[PDB]
Each structure stands twice: as structure tokens, then as C-alpha cells.
Amino acid sequence: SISARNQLKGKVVGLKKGVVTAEVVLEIAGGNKITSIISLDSVEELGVKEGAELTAVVKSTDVMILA
Amino acid sequence: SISARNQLKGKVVGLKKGVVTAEVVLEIAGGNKITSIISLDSVEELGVKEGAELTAVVKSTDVMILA
Amino acid sequence: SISARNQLKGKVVGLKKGVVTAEVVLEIAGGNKITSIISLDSVEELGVKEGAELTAVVKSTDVMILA
Amino acid sequence: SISARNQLKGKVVGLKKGVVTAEVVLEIAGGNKITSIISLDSVEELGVKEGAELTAVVKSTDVMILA
Amino acid sequence: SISARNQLKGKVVGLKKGVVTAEVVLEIAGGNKITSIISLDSVEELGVKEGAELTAVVKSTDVMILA
Amino acid sequence: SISARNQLKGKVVGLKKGVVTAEVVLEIAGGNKITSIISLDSVEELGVKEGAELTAVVKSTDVMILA
Numbered sequence: 001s002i003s004a005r006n007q008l009k010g011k012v013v014g015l016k017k018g019v020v021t022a023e024v025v026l027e028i029a030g031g032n033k034i035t036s037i038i039s040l041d042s043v044e045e046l047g048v049k050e051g052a053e054l055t056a057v058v059k060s061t062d063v064m065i066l067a
Numbered sequence: 068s069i070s071a072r073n074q075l076k077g078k079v080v081g082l083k084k085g086v087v088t089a090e091v092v093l094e095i096a097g098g099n100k101i102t103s104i105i106s107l108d109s110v111e112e113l114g115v116k117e118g119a120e121l122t123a124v125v126k127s128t129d130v131m132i133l134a
Numbered sequence: 135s136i137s138a139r140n141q142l143k144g145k146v147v148g149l150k151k152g153v154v155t156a157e158v159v160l161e162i163a164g165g166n167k168i169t170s171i172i173s174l175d176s177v178e179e180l181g182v183k184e185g186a187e188l189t190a191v192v193k194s195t196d197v198m199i200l201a
Numbered sequence: 202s203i204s205a206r207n208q209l210k211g212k213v214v215g216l217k218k219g220v221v222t223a224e225v226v227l228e229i230a231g232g233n234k235i236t237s238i239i240s241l242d243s244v245e246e247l248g249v250k251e252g253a254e255l256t257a258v259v260k261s262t263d264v265m266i267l268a
Numbered sequence: 269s270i271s272a273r274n275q276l277k278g279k280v281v282g283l284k285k286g287v288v289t290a291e292v293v294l295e296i297a298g299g300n301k302i303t304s305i306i307s308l309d310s311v312e313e314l315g316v317k318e319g320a321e322l323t324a325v326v327k328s329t330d331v332m333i334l335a
Numbered sequence: 336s337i338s339a340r341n342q343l344k345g346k347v348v349g350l351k352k353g354v355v356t357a358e359v360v361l362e363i364a365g366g367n368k369i370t371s372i373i374s375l376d377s378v379e380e381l382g383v384k385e386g387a388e389l390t391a392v393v394k395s396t397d398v399m400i401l402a
């Protein structure tokens with residue numbers, strides 16, 4: 001278990017690979033979408049591809065509130 | 068509009084105020100919960116309180132992927 | 135209103151687009167310059183281009199102090 | 202020199218100490234204010250105090266753009 | 269497995285609890301120390317305490333380079 | 336001196352340059368490896384290259400704990 005309190009299960013619905021990073025779009029429950037930019041190495045290692053079941057993890061101090 | 072692509076609508080179900088920061092917990096669609104730690108100053112200025120409808124925003128580079 | 139307490143108005147003076155991300159340079163008051171790396175999708179969506187008036191937003195917990 | 206491309210000189214106009222963190226407010230050129238939340242331990246070691254001339258540093262990937 | 273490429277095993281040598289967050293200090297291989305500020309809720313749930321063997325994880329986009 | 340409490344001295348053992356960003360892999364004491372994604376401008380400016388002695392700097396609120 002990791003300290004990051006946001007752990008949202010999702011399915012990949014978009015993937016764009018660059019040279020250093022890749023953009024991963026996950027659909028999570030309720031139809032929300034989360035977009036992640038991570039290293040291309042991690043995409044490759046985790047075998048990220050359309051339909052993959054993965055979890056989006058965000059540290060609490062990175063979540064802003066919009067009112 | 069802001070460049071942060073993740074905007075998750077939610078309702079505050081928990082709030083703990085510290086001296087410098089506060090922890091806000093939002094229930095989002097599908098029952099997922101998002102936890103945010105922001106400055107106490109912002110909580111006050113945005114009038115964040117239990118039950119409030121608000122939106123969590125996260126920059127894509129802050130979203131990690133777990134497999 | 136967003137919780138991020140740093141909101142600096144600026145004008146775009148530099149833009150470099152990659153495949154996933156783009157680098158945006160804003161000149162803010164007093165001659166300071168802020169450089170941002172964000173998703174290319176956002177640049178495109180916000181119509182970022184030289185001279186555009188935009189605001190740089192930074193969460194407090196991301197600001198370091200150098201003495 | 203550090204890779205963080207944003208280095209903004211300023212003067213501390215506010216300081217609030219908590220137990221683990223502290224909020225530092227710096228006035229920068231043009232009157233902009235930058236707000237930083239850092240560890241209390243750092244405030245102590247860098248001798249951060251009201252009126253001190255200090256520099257705020259932000260990594261480019263933490264700067265969002267608002268339009 | 270998670271996309272965050274940096275995973276550093278360590279032993280807790282310091283722990284300071286606040287109301288919202290907690291500061292965890294880990295000694296890692298070679299004697300380097302890593303300092304983490306996470307939510308108090310997580311410290312409790314992961315049962316973080318002095319002497320515990322734990323792993324520090326950091327997303328690559330959060331590591332700055334200083335020369 | 337900078338407020339970020341993690342300052343890990345290391346040597347570059349991997350470098351991959353993209354158009355906006357670059358991935359830098361540093362070996363630090365004890366054989367630990369740190370991977371950083373930073374702006375290509377900074378890579379160029381700091382003259383990052385294999386064997387360079389540099390320091391990985393991470394803010395405490397970016398360090399997660401895995402148990």
C-alpha cells in the first residue's frame with residue numbers, strides 16, 4: 001500500500017506516445033476521465049495499451065479545489 | 068479555462084483544518100473519493116465546508132499510473 | 135476560483151511544441167518570466183500563441199524557497 | 202544552478218508556522234505575491250523571517266496555464 | 269507496480285506528526301536521508317513508526333536536477 | 336541553499352533527449368538510481384551528459400511512502 005490517498009481504478013481509452021513521455025487517458029467510474037502524462041519507459045513497462053485496467057494515483061497535495 | 072485536464076466534480080464529505088493546511092475529502096461520481104490537502108487560507112476564502120459541491124483539479128503530470 | 139494561491143498574469147513570449155507536451159514562456163509584471171511545461175492538448179485547446187494573455191497558476195506546496 | 206527554470210526574487214511579507222509546514226508569502230517585482238508551503242524545518246534552517254529577501258523557485262512542470 | 273520510477277528502500281529515523289500531515293524521515297542506502305511530508309491519515313493506516321522499513325517513491329517529473 | 340530537503344548527489348548514467356523534455360538517470364550512493372524528467376532547456380544549460388555529477392532535488396511533499 002502507498003501513501004497517495006487518491007487511487008482511482010480505470011480503463012485506458014486514449015494513449016499518445018512521445019519520445020520521453022506518453023499521455024494516458026483513463027476512464028474511471030461514473031464516466032469521469034483522468035489524463036496522465038508519465039514516462040514512456042513506464043508505459044512500456046506496464047504494458048499500457050487501449051483497454052488496460054490500471055489505477056490512477058495522485059498525492060493529496062497535488063489536488064486543487066475549484067469553487 | 069485552465070490547462071489542468073482533470074476536473075472531477077464532487078461533494079465534500081470530510082474536512083479537517085490544520086494551521087497551515089486543511090484536508091478536504093470529496094465524494095465523486097461512482098462513489099470514488101478524492102482527498103486534497105490545500106492551504107487553510109484557500110479553504111476559508113473558497114468557503115469550503117461539509118456538503119459543498121466543488122471540483123477537484125489535478126495537472127496531468129501529477130497523475131501516476133499503477134498496474 | 136481555484137485554491138492555488140499563485141496566479142500570475144502574463145503574456146506569452148515563447149512557445150515550443152513537442153508531441154505530448156509544450157513549453158510556454160510567459161512574461162509577467164516587472165520583467166519576471168515564468169516557464170511552464172503542459173500537455174500539447176491544453177496548448178491547443180487554450181489557443182496558446184505568442185502574445186496571448188494567460189495566467190500562470192502554481193500550487194503553494196510546489197513553490198520552493200532559495201536563500 | 203538548478204534545473205527549475207522559474208526563479209523569482211522577493212521579500213517575505215507573511216509567515217505562518219505550523220508543526221510540520223509553514224506558509225511563506227513573498228512580494229515579488231510588480232507587486233505580485235507568491236505563496237509557498239514548505240517544511241517548518243526548512244524555514245528554521247534557512248532562517249526565513251518577515252522582511253527577508255529570498256527567491257521562490259518552481260519547476261516548469263508544476264506551472265499550469267489559465268486562460 | 270506503479271509508473272513512479274524512483275523507489276528507494278529505507279528505515280524511518282524520524283517522524284513528526286501534525287494535524288493534517290506528518291513528516292517522515294527515512295535513512296536510505298549509503299546513509300542519504302529522504303524526507304517525506306504525507307497525510308497524517310496515511311501514516312496511521314500504513315502504521316508508519318520509527319524503525320519501520322518502508323520505501324520512498326517519487327514521480328520522475330518531480331525530480332529537479334542541481335549542478 | 337534551497338528549502339527542498341531531499342538533495343541526493345549522483346552521477347548521470349542515462350540520458351534521453353526529447354524535444355521539450357529529457358529523461359536523466361542518476362546513480363546515487365548505495366547503487367540507488369533516480370530518474371528525472373526535466374526541460375530540455377535545463378539539460379542543455381546545465382550541460383547534462385553521461386558521467387556528470389549532479390544532484391537530484393525533490394520537495395518533501397512529492398515523496399510518497401510505500402509499505
Ligand SMILES: [Cl-]
Pocket residue numbers: 003004005006058059060061306307310
Ligand atoms: Cl496523499
Ligand SMILES: [Cl-]
Pocket residue numbers: 105106109137138139140192193194195
Ligand atoms: Cl495553493
Ligand SMILES: [Cl-]
Pocket residue numbers: 239240338339340341393394395396
Ligand atoms: Cl521540502
Ligand SMILES: [Mg+2]
Pocket residue numbers: 061062195196263330396397
Ligand atoms: Mg507536487
Ligand SMILES: [Mg+2]
Pocket residue numbers: 062128129262263329330
Ligand atoms: Mg508535481
